[PDB]
Design a protein around this ligand. Structure first.
Ligand SMILES: [Mg+2]
Ligand SMILES: [Mg+2]
Ligand SMILES: [Mg+2]
Ligand SMILES: [Mg+2]
Ligand SMILES: [Zn+2]
Lengths: 135, 104, 120, 79, 49, 178
RNA sequence: AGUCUUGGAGGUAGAGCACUGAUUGGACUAGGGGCCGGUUACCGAAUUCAGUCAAACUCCGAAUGCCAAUGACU
RNA sequence: UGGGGCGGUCGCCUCCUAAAAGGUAACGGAGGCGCCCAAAGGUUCCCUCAGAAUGGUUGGAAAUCAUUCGCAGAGUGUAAAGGCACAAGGGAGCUUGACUGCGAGACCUACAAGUCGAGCAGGGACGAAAGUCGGGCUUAGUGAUCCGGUGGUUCCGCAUGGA
RNA sequence: UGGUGGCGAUAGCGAAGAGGUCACACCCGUUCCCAUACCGAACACGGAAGUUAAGCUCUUCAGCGCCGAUGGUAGUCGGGGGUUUCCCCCUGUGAGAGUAGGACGCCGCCAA
RNA sequence: GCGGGGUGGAGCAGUUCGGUAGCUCGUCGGGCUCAUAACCCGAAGGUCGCAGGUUCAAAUCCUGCCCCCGCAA
RNA sequence: UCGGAUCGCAGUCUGCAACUCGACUGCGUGAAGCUGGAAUCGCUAGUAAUCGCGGAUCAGCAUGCCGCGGUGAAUACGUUCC
């Protein structure tokens, strides 16, 4: 599971997810990619599951770029406690994905094979996504 | 060594003129310990020295295998440390092969 | 190799520092001095308008001396500019040492300006 | 658990205290600040704690001070 | 270690000023020329014992 | 001085002809010579500085300035502001006087001397040669000396390139290693 | 007091990478370990090219709101 | 006080939350303070820092030099923020303004407090002079009243003089 | 030309040139004033042997840096709507980035 | 997550307040004995859990990191 | 100027042959060692102690072994104890 090696602050505001992706909206490195249509948090667990799905289907042929990184920490309070008495402890790591962001890129395979690999990955993710080609 | 003799950084940085008369003597002792020597001449070694320092000196000198020459009018200290005597009598120095207590 | 910084560039730094606390006004203008290898110059400039009221150097026809880059010449220059200032109704001035150490020729020019009757 | 945070100092009401174009009596505090966000211009002093105050009566004028810095001036009214 | 002190004027004795000093750095009674309001002039003030 | 007078009359015009400059001002000359005694044993021995300053005094014929560490370094147990070096700046006559003695006497007396290296230029026409023992200098008496300290001698020139500086030092009489 | 006009203080939204942190791929890499001082696609500092990201990052930077000034209309 | 209890907190400083004036809560997110300096203050004068490459006896990645590049990538007693390279950073000479009486007018503010202040007078430090100096780059380093101790005093003193 | 000011680097860096009779410099000395944590390097004090090589001044260059629209877009004020962690429409406003382009200084005073 | 421990081979001090690393037993070598034990005579064995700072000097003070033991878990 | 180890260099002799692995010589080098803890051994007179000499083995090689003489002591009260 991806996570930063250190962070400036362990506990961050959840923030807001308005507007389209600031950058990274086009396929830049690979030939094919999967593009987000909705905003959502993507946990490192979801990235790991998606990457394994797409890479296994490609039989370790061709490169996979992960264009999102789970930098944002999120917390959770202990089970069965009342409100208050301080912010929760850091639980996990998420990447904030806004509409337009290309999450994964694939290269070194046919489009037909690429489409299937990215379809399998998309079903591991909690957002709707479309297949895109580079320009 | 100074620290072991109870002179800490404070006293070390001060002019010797400020040190107590026994503190001045612990400073002179360190100048002796730092010498790589074979003989110890102790001229009145028990003046200006407190019980802990005198007791420690007594223990150490009993173990020392080199030559010790000590002048002291504390006959107890002499009688514990010295086994032979040079007596100054009638403008003559005579050597006696006996302890201070026996000679008297 | 060794690039030598220009003395003038260094001098301008010292002069700028002087000018932080010191500036010529209409009533009490700034007597600025410049000291070259060969000559010495004095201007009396009001800084609110950027106008030089009086001036005198070792290039004027009044001064007759050959070695113009020494204390004797500097004394005459300070005297001459100070006379012209009194004619133009300048009594009080601020001395701007131009980044030079207040010594030798510049000090000599200053002394001449006081005797001629500038209040500083 | 329990929080190790929860402290803060009183707000120091910094910032501009008179407007550009406004008439001020001498002594009036013009700007409170840490360091020199704004510099003292004409007829303005800088107090011990960087406060900018009018040295005379006049109109406050905030002005560009070179390329990246600002200053405030007080200009006496044209009688 | 660092203590409050009072400086008395050495002419009139008045304890005109209070200040602090670090006793290890300045163990001796400090002296300072300071304005004495009674004498209406600057005078040597010495730390009181 | 022999070397100084030699430069003004013979060497300077010769170098003008060599590189065909537009002005005599363009001829490389030697501006200053700094001799540095890295006193790294000043941390351990307190009187290490006094040894280096007494040698430079005789060697340079000019009172050195004691240089100190800019920052603390753990490896050497060095605290900022500790005197750990000596330095002396020679200009003008005293520079030539020392350089004359250095070339004529000191470098020959180096134990198994084989000429100074050709690679020891900074890249912009400044030479630095490392002296290892202070015995080569005839001012230093063997008996009084306790420790065998060396030194660095930086020749700073106005030559833009190393080639032009090398030509300058050669004619001055620098024993280059063939 | 409202509105219009004019001036000004400020660093948010957005945006951006110029600093501080986090971070992807390639290049170049000092070293580091595992092999016989010579190499492994073996951990790899740093540098650079492109590309992301930030409540407690900013080369920038609004809309509003705020403080005034001069008339005008109310 | 997301019942009470435990734990934590209680006064002050800095930042974020705070939504571009100011202000703004939660047992919201981060840290500091209860000092330090007799120079680390004042003034006069001078001055640039970190880092890298190359050259060099010990010398080694890194001690001291020397050249080139090099906006601050350093430093600024002490947190953080805001400032600072006509320096507020570094060095040197002399000094004690780390002054006395004050104070137009402002900020902040329920009050009590807190903050800034030109200028005036007295007597001074530095400076040739202008001029600067009522501590420190700025913002923490603190505690009302009552009651006691001490020093000064053209005050009072229970008939009067003292006490 | 030299000095001395004002103005956001459109004023700067970098590159290629050109100039000095006078002026500015480099440059030549340390008896004196003054000086360097050492050094006449600097700061001082004096001089004029020669050099435009550098500084400086004057040219040309858009290579770096700087300035900078219009349009579009994000955001946003006010007013609505919806499928409401958000999104869309209307009045107004309107960036940042990117770009056309600007720009290798403009305006003073004194002296020679 | 909350506390307590890491000092020669074993068990323990010394830590706050910096100043030669120690006590008991054990291990090793040599004696005594026919031989072993006891006993006698010498020595080794920890740089104080590990890695860096502060200091002239750190087991001791500071910073991180790794183990052991209690609970909750 | 005790002590002679170790080591460098150069040699002699024996032997087919002195590297592993010989004795001796010359030059140079100049170690530990300042009378030795617990403990323990020999000796009653020409003995102990000390000084040399010879011989067997043997081409060469002894600080060992077996012999020889030179100088030449101290002490034995006694049987309490091992
Ligand atoms: Mg006494
Ligand atoms: Mg944003
Ligand atoms: Mg509760
Ligand atoms: Mg605000
Ligand atoms: Zn008085």
């Amino acid at each position: 599971m991806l996570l930063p090696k250190r962070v400036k602050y362990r506990r961050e505001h959840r923030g807001k997810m308005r507007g389209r992706a600031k950058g990274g909206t086009e396929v830049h490195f690979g030939e094919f990619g999967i593009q987000a249509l909705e905003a959502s948090w993507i946990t490192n667990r979801q990235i790991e599951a998606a990457r394994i799905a797409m890479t296994r289907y490609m039989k370790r042929g061709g490169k996979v770029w992960i264009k999102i990184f789970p930098s944002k920490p999120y917390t959770a309070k202990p089970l069965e406690v009342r409100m208050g008495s301080g912010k929760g402890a850091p639980e996990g790591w998420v990447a904030v994905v806004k509409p337009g962001k290309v999450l994964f890129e694939i290269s070194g395979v046919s489009e037909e094979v690429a489409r299937e690999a990215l379809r399998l990955a998309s079903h591991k993710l909690p957002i709707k996504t479309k297949f895109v080609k580079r320009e | 060594l100074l620290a072991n003799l109870g002179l800490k950084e404070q006293l070390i940085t001060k002019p010797i003129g400020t040190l107590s008369l026994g503190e001045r003597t612990r400073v002179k002792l360190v100048d002796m310990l730092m010498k790589e020597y074979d003989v110890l001449i102790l001229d009145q070694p028990t003046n200006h020295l407190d019980l802990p320092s005198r007791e420690q000196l007594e223990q150490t000198l009993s173990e020392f295998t080199g030559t010790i020459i000590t002048v002291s009018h504390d006959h107890y200290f002499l009688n514990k440390l010295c086994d032979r005597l040079l007596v100054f009598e009638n403008q003559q120095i005579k050597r006696f092969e006996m302890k201070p207590q026996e000679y008297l | 190799m060794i690039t030598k910084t220009s003395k003038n560039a260094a001098r301008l730094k010292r002069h700028a520092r002087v000018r932080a606390k010191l500036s010529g006004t209409a009533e009490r203008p700034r007597l600025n001095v410049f000291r070259s290898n060969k000559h010495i110059y004095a201007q009396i400039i009001d800084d609110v308008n950027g106008v030089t009221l009086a001036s005198a150097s070792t290039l004027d026809k009044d001064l007759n001396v050959e070695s113009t880059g020494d204390t004797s010449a500097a004394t005459k220059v300070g005297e001459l500019v100070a006379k012209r200032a009194a004619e133009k109704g300048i009594s009080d001035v601020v001395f701007d040492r131009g980044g030079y150490l207040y010594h030798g020729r510049v000090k000599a020019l200053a002394d001449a300006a006081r005797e001629a009757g500038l209040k500083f | 658990g329990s929080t190790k945070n929860g402290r803060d100092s009183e707000a120091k009401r910094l910032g501009a205290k008179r407007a550009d174009g406004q008439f001020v009596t001498g002594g009036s505090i013009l700007y409170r600040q840490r360091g020199t966000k704004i510099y003292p211009g004409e007829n303005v002093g800088r107090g011990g704690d960087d406060t900018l105050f009018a040295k005379i009566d006049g109109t406050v004028k905030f002005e560009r001070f070179g390329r990246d810095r600002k200053k405030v001036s007080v200009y006496p009214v044209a009688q | 270690m660092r203590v409050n002190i009072t400086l008395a004027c050495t002419e009139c004795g008045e304890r005109n000023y209070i200040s602090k000093k670090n006793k290890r750095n300045n163990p001796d009674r400090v002296e300072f020329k300071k304005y004495c309001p009674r004498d209406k002039k600057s005078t040597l003030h010495r730390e009181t014992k | 001085n022999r070397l100084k007078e030699k430069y003004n009359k013979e060497i300077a015009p010769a170098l003008m002809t060599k590189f065909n400059y537009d002005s005599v001002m363009q001829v490389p000359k030697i501006e200053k010579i700094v001799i540095n005694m890295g006193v790294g044993d000043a941390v351990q021995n307190a009187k290490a500085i006094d040894s280096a300053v007494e040698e430079l005094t005789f060697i340079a014929g000019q009172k050195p300035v004691v240089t100190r560490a800019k920052k603390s370094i753990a490896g050497f147990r060095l605290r900022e502001g500790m005197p750990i070096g000596a330095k002396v700046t020679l200009r003008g006559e005293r520079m030539y006087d020392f350089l004359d003695k250095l070339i004529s006497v000191s470098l020959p007396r180096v134990r198994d001397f084989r000429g100074v290296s050709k690679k020891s230029f900074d890249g912009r026409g400044n030479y630095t040669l490392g002296i290892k023992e202070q015995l080569i200098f005839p001012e230093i008496d063997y008996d009084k000396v306790t420790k065998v300290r060396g030194m660095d001698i930086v020749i700073v020139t106005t030559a833009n390139t190393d080639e032009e500086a090398r030509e300058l030092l050669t004619q001055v009489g620098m024993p280059f290693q063939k």
